[PDB]
Amino acid sequence: GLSDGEWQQVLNVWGKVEADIAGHGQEVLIRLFTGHPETLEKFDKFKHLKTEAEMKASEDLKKHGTVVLTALGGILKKKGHHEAELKPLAQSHATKHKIPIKYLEFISDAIIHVLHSKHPGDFGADAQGAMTKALELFRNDIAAKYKELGFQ
Ligand code: HEM
Numbered sequence: 848g849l850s851d852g853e854w855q856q857v858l859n860v861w862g863k864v865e866a867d868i869a870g871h872g873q874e875v876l877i878r879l880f881t882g883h884p885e886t887l888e889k890f891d892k893f894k895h896l897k898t899e900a901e902m903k904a905s906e907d908l909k910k911h912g913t914v915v916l917t918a919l920g921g922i923l924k925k926k927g928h929h930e931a932e933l934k935p936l937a938q939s940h941a942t943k944h945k946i947p948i949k950y951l952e953f954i955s956d957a958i959i960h961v962l963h964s965k966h967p968g969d970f971g972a973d974a975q976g977a978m979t980k981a982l983e984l985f986r987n988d989i990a991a992k993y994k995e996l997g998f999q
């Protein structure tokens with residue numbers, strides 16, 4: 848797990864996201880979709896987005912970005928005690944949305960990139976370490992639920 852000190856760093860970094868949740872959420876999804884176009888295909892409601900300009904101009908994409916990072920934020924503030932919060936998301940993403948765990952790796956990497964891009968020089972080595980650990984814990988606990996469900 849993470850140390851108390853590491854959790855404190857995670858939640859300090861998260862303060863950056865909370866100041867502009869829509870903007871961070873939008874950039875995370877754009878980074879995901881542009882780096883990994885196969886991920887766009889999992890969203891019927893974003894499939895029409897044929898260019899990054901269209902992605903940037905999509906108010907619904909920003910809306911979903913807010914939904915996604917709000918959910919993640921709630922999970923992070925549980926500091927690993929997130930079974931109840933994580934369970935339903937693991938279940939919907941495996942069973943309904945059919946999201947391979949690899950795509951959760953992609954979006955985790957996208958979050959790290961967006962933090963550096965929006966806050967260059969203000970996302971320190973210790974902070975990256977802590978946030979990376981938190982995202983790995985999140986992914987690992989989702990993966991356990993995926994295995995329960997036999998989802999690949
Ligand atoms: C930080 C990781 C993620 C979080 C916190 C997250 C969160 C959410 C939430 C809260 C919802 C709405 C409720 C639900 O259906 O469970 C949702 C819907 C959805 N998610 Fe995710 N998600 C994540 C990663 C991903 C990834 C990587 C993909 C695909 C590559 C994905 C695909 C979808 C799809 C297709 C929906 C349904 C969208 C709609 O039609 O309205 N999710 N997600």
Ligand SMILES: O=N[O-]
Pocket residue numbers: 848849850926927928984
């Ligand atoms: O504190 N990590 O679960």
Ligand SMILES: O=N[O-]
Pocket residue numbers: 850851852853
């Ligand atoms: O929990 N202090 O590393």
Ligand SMILES: O=N[O-]
Pocket residue numbers: 876911915
């Ligand atoms: O954007 N992930 O639902």
Ligand SMILES: O=N[O-]
Pocket residue numbers: none
């Ligand atoms: O209507 N089920 O998303």
